[PDB]
């Protein structure tokens, strides 16, 4: 799979488990079209979102439902969700890992792109 | 001002200057309505986006145009922009500082909220 | 003041108040000599640590006592403290802002340096 | 191995490869005693630092030579190194992953502790 998502919890120092993730692809009319979704596993990872054939160049949005995650833990969060928007390119063969670190009032996201 | 945005550059270790910021509010019909916009100053801060009167309860989106910022420095970054989505003033009026820390392939954002 | 420290809390989305900060300078004999210390104020800032005259070239260490901060909130954190080590004024005098963002199992620190 | 280190590069959006890492254990006299060292691999990971038998409760310091890393890339960095200091506990069986995200003027570190 060319696309992977990894989510970490900065408060408990653990993978963020069972977090909902929705991926969208930008359509010709500039609206967001559902592309793939899933929930993070006990490793805080989400594999098998898509394949090489379907993952063509374009603009993608990864939406992480952080609000429901903090609500489950009884912690009041600031953000409705975390959004990561990027362009996928074919500048050679590549695997994309979208990593996110979550706190109730802060989040960080990083792209790890390897060949 | 109830809403302030502060942007830093993690590569140069300086404020991020002349960064475009657009703010939207979710309308009754569920679409994003333009709320305000501006550019960061020499100190990486954006003040005067709105007033107490105008800044009513609702869901807001702060979009920071990170791509244009990195491209003007010769760097092709990963993200199209950084988006911060939150509910504001749902327990009464508050002052919000949205801070963002930028790297070409990573960003973090934090909220500082005071009564 | 040439040296300023700013500390934020990622869990509460507020400045980190009453956090102890100790600053050390590397001496000729390679040991850490106490340089200054203080606690953050209501705004999470620590000013007046030193003056231009006293803040000469050298390697400095800023130690932020994060453990005591989290323990006073009922949280047992991961780190003993956050340490920031840097060479200062090796290309002439500068003004340094050391910012830190705290979570129980994570922290980030950034430097803002201006001429 | 109960202790692992993972290092990421926020500028290039890749693992930080061939980064030197030194681990120390706090001795009864409060000095830092060398414990283990190595260089990160092509995955930005460092495995096999120690074993269950030798990794007893105590205070450990992980030092990441970030300065040499940025120097190799021709980017001027702020910090001499990144330091992570923590207490290892036997609160049940556990594996520790110390993750770090690097920019020239900023770094973040997180502990991912799983069972």
Q: Distance between CA A11 and CA C54 in Å, rounded?
A: 39
Structure tokens at B38: 């501006």
Do the chains contact at C13 and B112, CB–CB below 8 Å? yes
Which chains does C contact via 3+ CB–CB distances below 8 A? A, B, D
Q: Distance between CA D91 and CA C18 in Å, rounded?
A: 30
- DSSP state for residue D66 in the 8-state scheme: H
Q: Distance between CA B70 and CA B75 in Å, rounded?
A: 5
The gap from C-alpha B109 to its chain's centroid, in whole angstroms, comes to: 9
Q: Is A45 annotated as a binding residue?
A: yes
Q: Distance between CA D98 and CA D115 in Å, rounded?
A: 15
Distances (CA, A) of D98 to B43, C16, C29, D82: 34, 24, 32, 12
- Evaluate the CA torsion angle D19, D103, D85, D32 in order and state its sign: positive
Technique of determination: X-ray
Distances (CA, A) of C96 to A15, C99, C115, D32: 35, 10, 9, 29
Q: Is A85 on the interface with D (CB under 8 A)?
A: no
Q: What are phi and psi of A101, to 5 degrees?
A: -120, 125
Tell me if C1 sits within 8 A of C51, measured CB to CB: yes
The gap from C-alpha D37 to its chain's centroid, in whole angstroms, comes to: 9
- Every domain of chain A and the residues it spans: 1-115
**Residue-by-residue DSSP string for C50-61:** --TTT--SEEEE
**Which of A113, A111, A102, A110 is closest to A19 using CA atoms?**
A102
Paired residues of D112 in beta bridges: D97
Number of H helices, E strands in chain D: 1, 9
- DSSP 3-state of A70: helix
Burial class (CB in 10 A: 0-12, 13-18, 19+), D27: exposed
Candidates C13, C14, C113; nearest CB to B14: C113
Q: Distance between CA C95 and CA A102 in Å, rounded?
A: 31
What is the 3-state secondary structure of chain B?
A: CCEEEEEEECCCCEECCCCEEEEEEECCCCCEEEEEEEECCCCCEECCCCCCCCCCCEEEEEEECHHHHHHCCCCCCCEEEEEEEEEECECECCEEEEEEEEECCEEEEEEEEEC
**Which of B2, B5, B3 is closest to B83 using CA atoms?**
B5
Do the chains contact at B101 and C114, CB–CB below 8 Å? no
First to last CA, chain D: 12
Candidates D15, D108, D111; nearest CB to A112: D15
- Evaluate the CA torsion angle D63, D32, C111, B88 in order and state its sign: positive
Q: Distance between CA A99 and CA A45 in Å, rounded?
A: 9
Paired residues of C95 in beta bridges: C114
Structure tokens at D81: 């190194």
Give the chain C residue nearest B101 (alpha carbons): C110
Angle at B42 between CA D80 and CA C95, to 5 degrees: 35
| Strand A95-103 versus strand A3-9 pairing type | parallel
Candidates C59, C79, C109; nearest CB to D85: C79
Q: How close is the nearest chain D Cα to the Cα of B54, in Å?
A: 36
Q: Distance between CA A49 and CA A4 in Å, rounded?
A: 7
Do the chains contact at C78 and D86, CB–CB below 8 Å? yes
Which chains does D contact via 3+ CB–CB distances below 8 A? A, B, C
Do the chains contact at C13 and A101, CB–CB below 8 Å? no
Q: Which helix (H) or strand (E) holds A58?
A: strand A58-64
CATH of domain A1-115: 2.60.40.180
Q: Distance between CA B60 and CA B55 in Å, rounded?
A: 10
Q: Is C106 on the interface with B (CB under 8 A)?
A: no
Q: What does the buried/exposed string (b/e) look like for C39-60 if buried means 16 or more CB atoms within 10 Å of the residue's CB? A: ebeeebbbeebbeeeebeebbb
Distances (CA, A) of C58 to A37, C84, C85: 52, 14, 11
**How many CB atoms are located within 10 Å of the residue A93 CB?**
9
- DSSP state for residue A72 in the 8-state scheme: H
Q: Distance between CA B31 and CA A18 in Å, rounded?
A: 29
Tell me if C103 sits within 8 A of C92, measured CB to CB: no
C58 phi-psi bin (left φ>0, alpha ψ -120 to 50, beta other): left
Q: Distance between CA B81 and CA B93 in Å, rounded?
A: 28
Radius of gyration of chain D (CA): 14
- DSSP 3-state of A57: coil
Q: Distance between CA A87 and CA B80 in Å, rounded?
A: 7
Tell me if A60 sits within 8 A of A24, measured CB to CB: yes
Structure tokens at C72: 């006073």
Q: Distance between CA A5 and CA A86 in Å, rounded?
A: 14
Q: Is C108 annotated as a binding residue?
A: yes
């Amino acid at each position: 799979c060319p696309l992977m998502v990894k989510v970490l919890d900065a408060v408990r120092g653990s993978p963020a488990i069972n977090v909902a993730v929705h991926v969208f692809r930008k359509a010709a009319d500039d609206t967001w079209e559902p592309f793939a979704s899933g929930k993070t596993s006990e490793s805080g990872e989400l594999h098998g979102l898509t394949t090489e054939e379907e993952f063509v160049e374009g603009i993608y949005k990864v939406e992480i439902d952080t609000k429901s995650y903090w609500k489950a833990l009884g912690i009041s969060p600031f953000h409705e969700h975390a959004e990561v928007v990027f362009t996928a390119n074919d500048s050679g063969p590549r695997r994309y890992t979208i990593a996110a670190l979550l706190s109730p009032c802060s989040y960080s996201t990083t792209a790890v792109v390897t060949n």
